[PDB]
Design a protein around this nucleic acid. Structure first.
Ligand SMILES: [Ca+2]
Ligand SMILES: [Mn+2]
Length: 430
DNA sequence: ATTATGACGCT
DNA sequence: AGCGTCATA
């Protein structure tokens, strides 16, 4: 009891931009602001595929991975912004550059781990200790947490949402013991103060709104972030975990949304995260392996130790294109033309990366899919990447994959290719 | 005929 | 190394 770790040593936040590609387009085009709108890629096939949706549009049932023509059936007034096309393919440069804007602001506050194009983890443990010493055991005012929800509160002995938020925050702050600098609840609270400041800086300096979660580890921070979107932040305390997890579907936890999570549910005959506490660590290891079992055993108790890695930049730079249905590449020169298109975009991004970040990729990965296959990827081969030249890279890509062709005729390609992928990897300092 | 990515684990 | 899993706009 004295020695049982509680996984409360760190303060971790996850900051996630609201409807990110939509906000990027709304900043650019004021006519889209405060409207049901979505971002789409391509247009010919069923109006294009939606990849981001404003909250106004979500209210009509518009979702990601919906065709625009179908979204227009739910929301006739839906406004659409198209992803840029370059060299015959969608080009995401505008959103990658907006991502860098936000990541650079966050980095002023602390070490961040880039987790996607629109979100990053923050280890706030040191920043919190410093702010605590400035504070001199002075109470934290509700005024410093103007957009913060405390998960699980209010509780016990107003019908409007902002009213409930303040009720919960007051109960939380009323309870706090600001006298103890080592108190995990106090540490989370100060972490939340800092994240309010970070989110205010992001909005001031970019125009973009975001949500955030604050907790003691990455999984809880990610879960917290989702609880009160958009434009709000949520503090999930160690103490809030039993109630939170008691009705939390297992698939909601990061890494459990796929096959492993489905197996936890099936094998154990349970539905909610909290139900995992009734198994021994060895039981969980027996079913799910040493690593997953130990992870699950601690995670269902609110404990996880995965560090926030100090990495602000992506580890790989890749370019890919699908060729679905009848557009599949059936001739050699088709294949070679697109390999060149991909390689030209890759060269452009790599050259920019080398100048910005002082590094060079050393490996080129080539991937394809074949019609009827499998699997998102059918085949993956690597070769050396020694010069940032598209023509060399595309010639090299063709070399490592040309034996995939089962056509006796070398002018034809069989089976037709439904995907091409070029990825640069293994960066070295330059 | 969601598409275009990007990280990490297994063997 | 090559494959598979899981994730995000
Ligand atoms: Ca987001
Ligand atoms: Mn995200």
């Amino acid at each position: 009891g004295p020695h049982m770790a509680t996984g409360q040593d760190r303060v971790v936040a996850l900051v996630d931009m609201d409807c990110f590609f939509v906000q990027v387009e709304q900043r650019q085009n004021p006519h889209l602001r405060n409207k049901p709108c979505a971002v789409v890629q391509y247009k010919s096939w069923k109006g294009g595929g939606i990849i981001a949706v404003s909250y106004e549009a979500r209210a009509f049932g518009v979702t990601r991975s919906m065709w625009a023509d179908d979204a227009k059936k739910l929301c006739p007034d839906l406004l659409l912004a198209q992803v840029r096309e370059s060299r015959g393919k969608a080009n995401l440069t505008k959103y990658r550059e907006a991502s860098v804007e936000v990541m650079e602001i966050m980095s002023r506050f602390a070490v961040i781990e880039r987790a996607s194009i629109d979100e990053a983890y923050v280890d706030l443990t040191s920043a919190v200790q410093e702010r605590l010493q400035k504070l001199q055991g002075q109470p934290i005012s509700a005024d410093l947490l103007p957009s913060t929800y405390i998960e699980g509160l209010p509780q016990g002995p107003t019908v409007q949402k902002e009213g409930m938020r303040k009720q919960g925050l007051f109960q939380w702050l009323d309870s706090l013991q600001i006298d103890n600098l080592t108190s995990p609840d106090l540490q989370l609270t100060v972490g939340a103060v800092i994240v309010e400041e970070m989110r205010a800086a992001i909005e001031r300096e970019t125009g973009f709104q975001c949500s955030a979660g604050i907790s003691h580890n990455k999984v809880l921070a990610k879960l917290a972030c989702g609880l009160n979107k958009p434009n709000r932040q949520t503090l999930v305390s160690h103490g809030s975990v039993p109630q939170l997890f008691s009705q939390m579907p297992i698939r909601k936890i990061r890494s459990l949304g796929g096959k492993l999570g489905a197996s936890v549910i099936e094998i154990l005959g349970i539905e909610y995260m909290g139900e995992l506490t009734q198994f021994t660590e060895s039981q969980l290891q027996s079913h799910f392996g040493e690593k997953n079992g130990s992870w699950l055993y601690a995670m269902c108790r609110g404990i996880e130790h995965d560090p926030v890695k100090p990495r602000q930049l992506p580890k790989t730079i890749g370019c890919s294109k699908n060729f679905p249905g009848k557009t599949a590449l059936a001739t050699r020169e088709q294949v070679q033309w697109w390999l060149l298109q991909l390689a030209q975009e890759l060269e452009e991004r790599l050259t920019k990366d080398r100048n910005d970040n002082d590094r060079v990729a050393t490996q080129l990965v080539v991937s394809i899919r074949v019609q009827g296959d499998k699997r998102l990827s059918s085949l993956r081969r690597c070769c050396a990447l020694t010069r940032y030249d598209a023509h060399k890279m595309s010639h090299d890509a063709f070399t490592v994959i040309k034996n995939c062709n089962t056509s006796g005729i070398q002018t034809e390609w069989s089976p037709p290719l439904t995907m091409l992928f070029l990825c640069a990897t293994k960066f070295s300092a330059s």
